[PDB]
Every structure is written in C-alpha cells, then in structure tokens.
C-alpha cells in the first residue's frame, strides 16, 4: 500500500551515476556511506525507528553492496567494476588469493544478471527486498518489516509480467538469485573477518564498524 517501483528506481539512479583486496576494501568503505543515502530514499524505510534502520543495514549491507557492483559489472569481460572507478580482473583476484569467491561472484551473479538482462528497476527491488529482512535479530516489530517486503515484491511482480509479458517466469528467476547472494555474502564476510585478524589489509572506520558485535 504505497511502494511504487518508480521511487525505487530513483533511489538507484540517485546513488550511482595495488593489492586488489585493499582496493576492494577501500571501495566497500566508500559504498557504505552511499548505501545509507540509498536506504533513506527507499519508501517507508526512514519512517521505521532508528534502531530498526540500524539493524536492517547492519544485517544486509554486504548482500546489498554485492548486488550493486555485480549488476554494475554486467558489461565487463571477466572482472568487476569497483565504485572507486577501478577494474578488478579475474586473474588479478586469482593472484591475490581470492579467486574462488571472485569466481562465484562472476558465475552465480554477474553472469546470470547478464543472461537475463536484469534492469536497474529490477535490481532496486531485489535490493529493497533484501533491505527489508524480517528475519533480522533485534527487530522491534518484524511483522511491520515483513509488510514492507511484501509490498516490494508485489510491485516487482507487477513491473514484471507487464514489462516482460513474454517471460512468465521472470519474477521467480529474480528471487532465485537471493539464495546465491546470501551464500556469497556470508563467504565474503568470513574473508573480511580473516583479513582483519591477519593484520594486513587496511580497513577503514565505516567498514570496521560493520564488523563489530553483534
């Protein structure tokens, strides 16, 4: 009841016009600020209590950020395009020791988004569905968050079926990337925790704050 795909697309278009791992971390810290402004632009997000806004962003920042640069890298050959305006080629990631996860991002995400020509509007929604995760621990009123999530995927199914009539199974195909994203998101965090432990790899204040407890 008041979750138009138009406002969602606007949040998306408004936020985005030497050790590959270090460059990746610098970019993630950078994107963390933008993600806050993005969320604020998502209908009804700001009306939730500040504590739930914090929970939702702390719970999904990683998947949210992985979906973005994946879709951003759709035109790239074998690598992702970082927000810092830097490209990380498959081989670069391989010789830095993170080839496995990088390959999972190329195969399970970038490639699939490309094969189905996922559009910016569809992305925005998938990210909005991820933001509104009713399963986040701590939520003061999870049912409310579940309501928002339902309005989002209702508008998405509406956008689909109407924009891609020839494709009756497009709605599901889009939601079915969510298990992959969650999986790749958990693996990426593990790496982030290891890098922190190791002591190498500079980690900026906002990215560091995300690795705090809980």
């Amino acid at each position: 009841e008041d979750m138009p795909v138009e406002r969602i697309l606007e949040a998306e278009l408004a936020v985005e016009p030497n050790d590959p791992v270090t460059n990746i971390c610098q970019a993630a810290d950078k994107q963390l600020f933008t993600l806050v402004e993005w969320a604020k632009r998502i209908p009804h997000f700001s009306e939730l209590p500040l504590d739930d806004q914090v929970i939702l962003l702390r719970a999904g920042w990683n998947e949210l950020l992985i979906a973005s640069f994946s879709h951003r890298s759709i035109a790239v050959k074998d690598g992702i395009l970082l927000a810092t305006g830097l490209h990380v080629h498959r081989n670069s990631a391989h010789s830095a020791g993170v080839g496995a996860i990088f390959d999972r991002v190329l195969t399970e995400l970038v490639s699939k988004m490309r094969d189905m020509q996922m559009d910016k509007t569809e992305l925005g929604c998938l990210r909005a569905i991820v933001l509104f995760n009713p399963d986040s621990k701590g939520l003061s009123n999870p049912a409310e968050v579940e309501a928002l999530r339902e309005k989002v995927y209702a508008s998405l199914e509406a956008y689909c079926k109407h924009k891609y009539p020839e494709q009756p199974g497009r709605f599901a195909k889009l939601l079915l990337r969510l298990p992959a994203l969650r999986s790749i998101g958990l693996k990426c965090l593990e790496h982030l925790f290891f890098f922190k432990l190791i002591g190498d790899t500079p980690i900026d204040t906002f990215l560091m704050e995300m690795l705090e407890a809980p």
Binding site: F33, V36, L50, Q53, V54, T205, E212
Partner: peptide
Amino acid sequence: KHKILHRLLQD
C-alpha cells in the same frame, strides 16, 4: 555502539 551509522541516519 554503531556511532557512524547512527549519525548518518539522523542527518
């Protein structure tokens, strides 16, 4: 806890 995040959200 979560200093930065809170500040960015209130603004």
